[PDB]
């Protein structure tokens, strides 16, 4: 167990002790244990702290702010993650300077202490969000082994959606999260139900779950209705995920998805399921989602009336879990050669076992697909295509003094058609990879793999100018419209965003903020709203779209596009330094950019930053 999760029984025990002590403190309890600093968060058992009253969504969900959590999103697709609003408000309320939580975190950071976030019930959920906050504020800025956090939760509700889990996987952060769940514990299942389904019964169940509230008399009816509603919505979510994961029946699934309201919350991080005799660790979020349903069923038909009460009592059974940790059999489900025994001890039916096996096989498929992609991008014929473009086509076009953009665009020689052939083959391969990414058929880590980011960036920088030339060569700017608006292949947008995320995420800023800060840094004097209006769908956001902007700027009067001109000029040097734009090309005598640049008014050219890089018109 310890060589997989990276935490031992000592840390689990201390985390449980701190979680218990947190019941008696304001907001949080700090426990200093030599080299370890444990932050335990006070749990809450009011419905307000599970479904925010002012939240108007069916599951109390809210999108994260892309500024404060730039990594919690899909990179290529852009979609930001969604979390439970009540838990986010509770974390926000504890990060509040008056609580000394942040000051203590920074004191432990400067002291290179091992920081541990923990909590029971919803407090553990806060710990999960605090860990993400920590990962965004501290760990991503300087990833040391001393700075690595640990998140340990006990019976925590679900917090994020599928994008949340995917982003955690891509950043290699999932390994830090361990969520202990007693087999029947209802609390991890609560947020899988529609809020209208439990609006009447939630306060009573929360009152029964509070360990310090032995006042409200237990009611059989309310608990049974609650259990039935939660299991019904959970079954609907799990069956839809089952039908969607295997890619079959996509038409009827898409139509019902338009007409079905299913909880978005998904397991994030490692889950450890516990019984009297077994500890079963599971990593695959889909498998955990299925197990949250199929492990909480009755064996006989006589126990169906009993399960809801055991599902309540099991939330207060974590003391026994922690005390009997070393006496239980452990196994790693994902690494097992046979999973029948483990799931049989967890009461998982045959069908639930087949769904778990299918989820694991789907993850193995994604891994195989990634192995195939690595083999492809490491083959000689593939790297040779890029080498040929870089070392033969570009120098020959530079020797003709017009550049390889203009040479491709006019395509007067056989070499231009050969470059077009290799451009089409590369386009097909990267579109096929993009297709796999869109269907979630690659591992979560794929977009974070530095070898892939390197290759895709080299590809984008080399060949996107050629796809822009192909676009304008066939007059698609007049038929379809501006390249930046309706023409840009999605594969290049994915490559750009993957590269930007890779290089920007250690500094906590997002690409848009950097861009607009440079725009205001160019001292144009115009109103920021007006400039954002002018630079809407501008080609100046990506160096490999340099030529697209030239196409959009040539032909227009100078006054009409003066701002976009000075913007394009202000981005050029970093683009050249970073290798996004080749300095041996764009300044050639026969280059479209140079030919258009000379026709600009002499008043601009005189005080233009590019005057010293091209001879004047004499």
């Amino acid at each position: 167990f310890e060589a997989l999760t990276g935490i031992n029984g000592d840390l689990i025990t201390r985390s449980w002790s701190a979680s218990k002590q947190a019941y008696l403190t304001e907001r949080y309890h700090k426990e200093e244990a030599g080299a370890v600093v444990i932050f335990a968060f006070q749990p809450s058992f009011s419905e307000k702290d599970f479904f925010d009253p002012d939240n108007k969504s069916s599951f109390g969900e809210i999108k994260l702010n892309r500024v404060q959590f730039p990594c919690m999103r899909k990179i290529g697709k852009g979609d930001v993650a969604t979390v439970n609003e009540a838990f986010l408000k509770n974390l926000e309320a504890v990060i509040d300077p008056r609580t000394s939580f942040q000051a203590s975190v920074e004191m432990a950071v400067r002291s290179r202490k091992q920081i541990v976030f923990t909590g029971h019930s919803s407090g553990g959920a806060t710990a999960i969000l605090a860990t993400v906050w920590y990962l965004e504020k501290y760990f991503i800025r300087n990833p040391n082994v001393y700075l690595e956090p640990r998140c340990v939760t006990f019976g925590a509700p679900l917090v994020g959606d599928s994008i949340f889990s995917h982003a955690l996987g891509r950043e290699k952060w999932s390994r830090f999260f361990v969520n202990f769940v007693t087999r029947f514990d209802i609390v991890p299942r609560i947020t899988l139900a529609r809020k209208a389904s439990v609006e009447e019964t939630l306060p009573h169940v929360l009152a029964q779950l509070d360990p310090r509230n032995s006042s409200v008399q237990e009611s059989e009816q309310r608990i049974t209705e609650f259990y039935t509603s939660v299991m019904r919505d959970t079954s609907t979510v799990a069956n839809q995920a089952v039908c969607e994961l295997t890619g079959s029946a996509e038409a009827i699934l898409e139509t019902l998805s338009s007409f079905l309201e299913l909880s978005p919350y998904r397991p994030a991080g490692t889950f450890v399921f516990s019984t009297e005799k077994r500890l079963v660790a599971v990593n695959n979020s889909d498998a955990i989602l299925q197990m949250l349903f199929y492990t909480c069923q009755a064996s006989d038909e006589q126990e169906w009336s009993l399960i809801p009460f055991r599902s309540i009592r099991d939330h207060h059974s974590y003391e026994e879990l922690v005390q009997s940790m070393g006496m239980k059999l452990f196994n790693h489900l994902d690494g097992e050669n046979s999973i029948e025994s483990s799931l049989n001890d967890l009461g998982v039916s045959t069908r639930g076992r087949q769904y778990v096996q299918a989820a694991l096989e789907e993850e193995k498929k994604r891994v195989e697909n990634q192995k195939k992609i690595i083999q492809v991008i490491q083959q000689e014929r593939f790297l040779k295509k890029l080498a040929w473009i870089e070392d033969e086509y570009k120098p020959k076009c530079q020797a003709h003094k017009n550049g390889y953009y203009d040479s491709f665009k006019v395509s007067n020689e056989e070499n231009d058609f050969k470059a077009n052939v290799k451009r089409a083959e590369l386009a097909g391969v990267f579109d096929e990879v993009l297709g796999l990414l869109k269907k979630c058929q690659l591992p979560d880590e794929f977009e974070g793999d530095i070898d892939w980011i390197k290759l895709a960036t080299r590809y984008r920088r080399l060949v996107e100018p050629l796809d822009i030339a192909n676009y304008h060569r066939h007059l698609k700017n007049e038929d379809t419209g501006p390249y930046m608006k309706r023409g840009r292949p999605t594969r290049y947008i994915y490559a750009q965003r993957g590269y930007e995320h890779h290089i920007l995420k250690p500094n906590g800023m997002i690409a848009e903020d950097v861009f607009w800060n440079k725009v205001n840094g160019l001292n144009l004097g115009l109103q920021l709203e007006e400039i954002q209006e002018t630079l809407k769908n501008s080609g100046s956001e990506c160096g490999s779209c340099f030529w697209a902007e030239v196409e959009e700027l040539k032909g227009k009067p100078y006054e009409e596009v003066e701002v976009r001109v000075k913007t394009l000029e202000g981005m050029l040097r970093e683009w050249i330094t970073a290798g996004e734009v080749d300095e041996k090309e764009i300044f050639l005598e026969g280059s479209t950019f140079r030919k258009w640049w000379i026709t600009l008014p002499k008043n601009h050219k005189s005080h233009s930053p590019l005057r010293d890089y091209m001879m004047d018109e004499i």
Partner: nanobody
Amino acid sequence: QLQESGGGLVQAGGSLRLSCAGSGRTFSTYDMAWFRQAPGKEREFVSSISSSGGNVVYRDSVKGRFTIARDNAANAVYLQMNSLKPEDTAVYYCAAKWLAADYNYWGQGTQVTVSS
């Protein structure tokens, strides 16, 4: 724990100052914003302060007439409303919220009536 104040009744061209104060450490870690709810009309966005950053963008009907300001010492928000329009009669609310896409810490709001 967000509360507004400063709503009154004045005709066109009036100068008003709406104040918005909270009980938690809000100021520059929650990016402020002002919305207005007109009777029947949507809660149309008025403006927003980008918390610590001085970035701020009003929308059309206001630019150069309603200023927005923050106060970290008093953790308050100040909406100056000069050259009022009879079409500005609405319930003004201040919303401050971060870690999220859309804001969701709303107050009680205050009525602002402009006649002719």
